[PDB]
């Protein structure tokens, strides 16, 4: 058991990355590690996508502690460059969080991925 434990495989990875791009297009995404912990302790977060290959790993292993505190699903995606490309920014991100909105056109996608990674965990 490594430190980035629930690593989503290929299908769940592109599922996660598609909902990350749609949430970034509809401004429901908050990107970065300490932005992710800010929104995790604030409460506007459905689920949080960390990377599994940042330059240290504990720089974002500080996040699953807050996730098991506040019952938020967390998934390690296997490429920070791919996660930056999905978020739609010009630099590789390592963590992102889906803020809670109810007036959202992608709630069923966000919820289906959230249920899938709750089964995964």
């Amino acid at each position: 058991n490594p430190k980035a434990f629930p690593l989503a495989d290929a299908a769940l990875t592109q599922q996660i990355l598609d909902v990350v791009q749609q949430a970034a297009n509809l401004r429901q995404l908050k990107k970065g590690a300490n932005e992710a912990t800010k929104t995790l302790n604030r409460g506007i977060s459905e689920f949080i996508i960390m990377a599994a290959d940042c330059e240290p790993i504990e720089i974002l292993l500080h996040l699953p502690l807050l996730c098991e505190d506040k019952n938020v699903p967390y998934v390690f995606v296997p490429s920070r460059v791919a996660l930056g490309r999905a978020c739609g920014v010009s630099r590789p991100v390592i963590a992102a969080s889906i803020t809670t909105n109810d007036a959202s056109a992608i709630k069923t996608q966000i919820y289906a991925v959230k249920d899938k990674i709750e089964t995964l965990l």
């Binding site: 990355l17 598609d18 599994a52 290959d53 504990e58 490429s79 791919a82 590789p92």
Partner: protein
């Protein structure tokens, strides 16, 4: 089949089809330049001219029926090159730099008629008659420069807040430009008339790449919808070609007795004839596609190899090699060099693929048009390949080509790209022969 097999309607339509005109631009000609194995590979003159521009982005070239190429950089600079001397480096003819001088004084959409760029010129296209070059990027503008002066003779905005153009293609032997805007839009312009013909919508993520040929058709591909569409612009219709490689069933195909996996994003296209095309994907797939099949005919799973594993000295920060090696999870986080520039010589048997694998790969499609094969590798271009194209010379039996490709150290749209292993920024030119 009997002795009498005529239909009155069909012989009537062939009477009218003889009576009509324009057997000129509608050439549905398949691959006829079947020269895949005839030319050599391992003796191309590989001249990499390193140029003094951070992050070149694209190359437009030219042949008539002198020869110039063009380059465009992330430092807001177009630069024209003479390439008519077929055995040396290209030479600089005019630089052209935009910058903070051409930010508009209004911050409003219709009056973006400033005469230069200010951010990230993304693609360029030289006219088939060579009179004009056009270039554009994230300043939501298309700028047309003259050939003999490099003046902006017209500035046409895309006219919305996300109107980033990302790929340009003139159709062949005509003065009509198809630019694939990030608004899930395709805009068409007539450059000798300076007009917009048709805007045409229909992709689902940003329309990252475009390609055209002799007919009025076009082929476009969007980023993460993982579909490639082709457009009849007179009829304003399209065919959608999704991907569809399942990693679990490909694991089952190997498990009849293996790091191949799912698909992230289709990146690049090049239309090879008027009945096929090839798409380069995010997991290093190169796929060859018909006009009569949704799913692709042939898939090459990994075309440029797999990124190097992250170092144990830079994975965790634990003390022991055992736990730092444990934190790689085995093969679970190996990712491939995504094919990021693809080019077809038109109606030909060969095509070129490039990324930051360090070596371009020349491939040839088989004669039956159902598969393709690696010919050879070109190990003289260290860095990301932001554009590939080919220049020809010589008659039908004996011909000599120079691959002009652009090499940078970062991707052409976002940066995202670390581990610059000694890459340089410039023009790679490989003269292959026969």
């Amino acid at each position: 089949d009997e002795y009498n097999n005529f239909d009155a309607g069909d012989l009537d339509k062939d009477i009218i089809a003889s009576r009509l005109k324009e057997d000129v631009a509608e050439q549905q000609g398949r691959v006829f330049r079947y020269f895949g194995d005839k030319l050599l590979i391992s003796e191309a003159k590989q001249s990499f001219t390193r140029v003094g521009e951070n992050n070149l982005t694209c190359i437009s070239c030219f042949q008539p029926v002198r020869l110039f190429a063009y380059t465009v950089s992330k430092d807001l600079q177009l630069t024209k090159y003479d390439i008519t001397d077929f055995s040396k480096r290209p030479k600089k003819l005019k630089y052209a730099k935009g910058g903070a001088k051409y930010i508009p004084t209004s911050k409003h959409e219709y009056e973006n008629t400033t005469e230069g760029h200010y951010d990230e010129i993304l693609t360029v296209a030289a006219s088939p008659d060579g009179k004009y070059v056009v270039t554009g990027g994230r300043d939501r503008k298309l700028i047309v420069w003259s050939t003999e002066s490099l003046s902006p003779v017209k500035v046409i905005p895309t006219k919305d807040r996300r109107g980033e153009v990302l790929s340009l293609a003139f159709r062949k032997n005509s003065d009509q430009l198809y630019a694939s805007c990030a608004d899930f839009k395709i805009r068409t312009y007539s450059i000798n008339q300076f007009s917009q013909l048709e805007i045409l919508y229909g992709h689902h993520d940003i329309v990252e790449d475009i390609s055209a040929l002799a007919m009025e058709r076009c082929v476009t591909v969007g980023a993460r919808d993982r579909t490639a569409m082709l457009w009849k612009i007179p009829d304003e219709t399209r065919l959608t070609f999704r991907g569809g490689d399942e990693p679990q069933k490909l694991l089952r195909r190997w498990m009849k007795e293996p790091l191949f996996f799912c698909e992230g994003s289709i990146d690049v296209v090049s239309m090879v004839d008027d009945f096929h095309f090839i798409t380069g994907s995010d997991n290093g797939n190169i796929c060859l596609w018909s006009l009569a099949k949704k799913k692709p005919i042939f898939t090459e799973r990994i075309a440029h190899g797999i990124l190097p594993e992250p170092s144990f000295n830079d994975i965790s920060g634990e003390t022991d090699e055992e736990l730092r090696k444990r934190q790689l999870q085995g093969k679970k986080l190996l990712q491939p060099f995504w094919i990021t520039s693809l080019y077809a010589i038109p109606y030909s048997n060969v095509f070129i693929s490039g990324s930051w694998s360090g070596s371009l790969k020349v491939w040839k499609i088989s004669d039956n048009l159902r598969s393709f094969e690696l010919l050879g590798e070109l190990s003289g271009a260290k860095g990301v390949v932001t554009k590939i194209q080919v220049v020809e010379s010589g008659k039908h039996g004996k011909e000599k080509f120079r691959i002009l490709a652009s090499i940078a150290k970062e991707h052409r749209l976002g940066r995202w790209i670390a581990n610059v292993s000694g890459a340089r920024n410039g023009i790679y030119s490989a003269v292959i022969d026969q």
